[PDB]
């Protein structure tokens, strides 16, 4: 019942197939406001009507999957997703006709093809056709439509459907393929955002991931080549050309977990921050400079989260990697032999077990970095590090003293933030990377006459002003708790056009939520399950709505 209708006319369907379809709706997470979330709208390529439950099954799959990774499992109940029951005359595989005109180019990229049937305007699709038309019927900001798609504005053919891509954060296709295949068009000046992946494909869920990191956390492809330029050094998240340690964006960063410059292949003039990286290779995961740009980019599409603080890490400290002359070389032998000199030194996450009585004497630095995402209020965070017996206790020295140092740090304010994809920018062009950042580092001299036991380990706590556990020695390894949204009727049937998904929270988190007001045109009754600890995998939040 719930749907969207288009209009496309020859420059969207020049051969008449797609002149006015019906596109049913499906809200797989609606956890707030429209207007308070960040908004993904997934379309299906090469799904034919009788296929658009394997389309639903494939978005929910892709999504909570993505939902796994660092930065975005931090937001994970801040974006609400819509599946577009876009239904395609074949098959993807069969090779005629499709929703969306995609073909797969000689370098293998997934392309909008204008060419293959002559819709001249076909990859403006999203944001002249349906962008506007969700933003007016099912987005909750409900923005009339400002100009007919199917005529040529007068002055520009673009600024009419900026509006677009900030109601709605990210567009994605998913094409009904186990082809392996990926593609990222952003380019907002003339109207492009939005991804295409396969449903299908051996890692559908790693390039699904990598594509968004590319499409709305902004960070480039670490696989790329060539010598950055100032402004295009300015204007580039996460990659560098800057060869010195102590001028690169990202230095505050160097010696924190796997972070050290090095070159992204055998003489290439283009830097990362972390060899082992999603965007450099799908198998690995975000690295902290991603993370950090990611979680960034995200807090300007919400209103309510203020810090970020990276998971803090425990390493003896020896003075190895502790200044910027040890971070001069940048080959990959130089990464590695920085990394396994980590693992060598590392005392927190599942090296925890590392300390040992032989630790007397030894220094110990406890490491994170902190962002502030206010640009208004300065912070004050305090560190508390101690040794701990197993048995829970605080270790002393032998004049009983604690084993315990605390250290505060002063974290200033977001100055530059609106320099860094604010709602409404077309681009990022410059920021200070070090605007609202502070690596943070404790580091405490363990007594010659320390009372150590066996089984002896490092605990720690960030804490906010007042006393709040933001991080501890727990944090790294803590256990994660599957959380299942489900959409109701008061009378418990379950809402059409609902595909409530799951995703993942720390062990014992309470969510709180506003709900949204409206779900399409049905009120907010009640939800049970916020405000409570989630201790159960297959926890059910249930939102009901009246009939
Ligand atoms: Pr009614
Ligand atoms: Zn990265």
Sequence with gaps: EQSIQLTLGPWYSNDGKYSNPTIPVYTIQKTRSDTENMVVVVCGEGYTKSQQGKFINDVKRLWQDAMKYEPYRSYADRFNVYALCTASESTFDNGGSTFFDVIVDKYNSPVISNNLHGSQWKNHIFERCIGPEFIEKIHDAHIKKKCDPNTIPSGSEYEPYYYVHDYIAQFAMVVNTKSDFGGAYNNREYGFHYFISPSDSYRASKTFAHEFGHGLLGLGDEYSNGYLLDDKELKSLNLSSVEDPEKIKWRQLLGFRNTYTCRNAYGSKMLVSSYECIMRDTNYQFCEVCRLQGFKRMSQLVK????????????????????????????????????????????????????????????????????????????????????????????????????????????????????????????????????????????????????????????????????????????????????????????????????????????????????????????????????????????????????
């Design 304 to 547: 309510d989260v203020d810090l970020y603080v990276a998971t803090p890490e425990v390493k003896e400290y020896t003075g190895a990697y502790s200044k910027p002359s040890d971070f001069t070389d940048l080959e990959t032998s130089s990464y590695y032999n920085y990394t396994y000199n980590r693992n060598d030194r590392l005392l927190s996450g599942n090296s925890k077990s590392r300390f040992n009585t032989n630790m007397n004497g030894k220094k110990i630095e406890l490491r994170t970095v902190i962002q502030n995402i206010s640009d208004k209020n300065a912070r004050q965070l305090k560190f508390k590090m101690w040794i701990k017996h197993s048995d829970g206790s605080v270790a002393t020295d032998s004049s009983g003293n604690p084993l315990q140092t605390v250290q505060t740090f002063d974290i200033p304010v977001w100055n530059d933030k609106a320099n860094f994809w604010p709602l409404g920018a077309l681009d990022h062009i410059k920021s200070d990377f070090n605007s609202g950042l502070k690596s943070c580092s404790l580091i405490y001299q363990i007594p010659s006459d320390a009372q150590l036991k066996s089984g002896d380990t490092v605990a720690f706590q960030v804490l906010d002003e007042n006393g709040n556990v933001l991080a501890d020695d727990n944090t790294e390894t803590q256990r994660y708790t599957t959380v299942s949204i489900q959409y109701k009727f008061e009378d418990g049937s379950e809402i059409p056009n609902t595909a409530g998904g799951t995703f993942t929270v720390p062990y014992g988190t309470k969510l709180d939520l506003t709900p949204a007001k409206t779900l399409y045109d049905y009120e907010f009754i009640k939800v049970d399950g916020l405000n409570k600890p989630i201790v159960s995998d297959g926890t059910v939040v249930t939102y009901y709505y009246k009939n």
